[PDB]
Design a protein around this nucleic acid. Structure first.
Lengths: 74, 76, 74, 75
DNA sequence: ACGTAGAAGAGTCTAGACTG
DNA sequence: CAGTCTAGACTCTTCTACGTA
């Protein structure tokens, strides 16, 4: 927990980071925009939404995960 | 048309399964650490909450009308 | 002929049907539609256009490949 | 703008790599049969020819303006 | 500096076998 | 059965190796 969290999450980064949400209101928001604004990418803006909220519910964990993900560029 | 265009559009969706697919390394790692360190964690539940929170913040009017039509259309 | 070509094409059906086209006019039309009509799927209409084009250059060949692709679902 | 709107929208794209990735069993099988049973078969030339043809038949106005700006680009 | 052919791959968006 | 969570066809764009009369 004293920066050990890092290596706990390293076990997970070698697999596809797919998250499957089930919600009527967010699906309706995203789908409505998909059908009214051209070029709308639903799953990228869902990524934006989900990261923004989750970075607010678990700030420390999200910071550590973001660090590991950014330093992952190769 | 009073901007109840939004409700009439969104009603063309209710019959369909509301699955959203997200590809995010940071969010996935946060949810996976939570799932493997707290007992009885529900990953998709927490994902749903984070997504709805952010989506409300980025689209307040859209999400409010969507939440209305979700609670109203699914009460029975 | 004589459905020899049938088994010459069954060799290839185990791989991804990716076809990589580079075409300024086609790309421009597909992108313009992607930015002006909401919900425009660029590559499936590209698929429809390429299948329309072949079905007029190699109608026999396309017919036989189409029978094979349809019956592949089983 | 007087339906020269389309050209203004298109000229915002011209700098890009004009790539198109198609996924279809029938057309893939046909182009592959031709590739293996034709000496020096172009195949991507041919895919481009068929695609441009089909787009012309489907979006003739769009395709004319796009082909106009395409010829215009260099010459 | 390079137009373009193939090849490769991060992502998409729905599907589906599976729990609760 | 409503949601899970991962799997897969398929989307689009980048990448690589390569002759550009």
């Amino acid at each position: 927990e004293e920066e050990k969290i890092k290596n706990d999450m390293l076990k997970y980064i070698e697999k596809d980071p797919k998250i499957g949400v089930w919600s009527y209101p967010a699906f309706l928001v995203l789908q409505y925009l998909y059908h009214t604004v051209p070029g709308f990418k639903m799953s990228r803006t869902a990524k934006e939404a989900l990261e923004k909220g989750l970075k607010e519910m678990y700030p420390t964990l999200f910071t550590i995960a973001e660090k590991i993900a950014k330093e992952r560029f190769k």
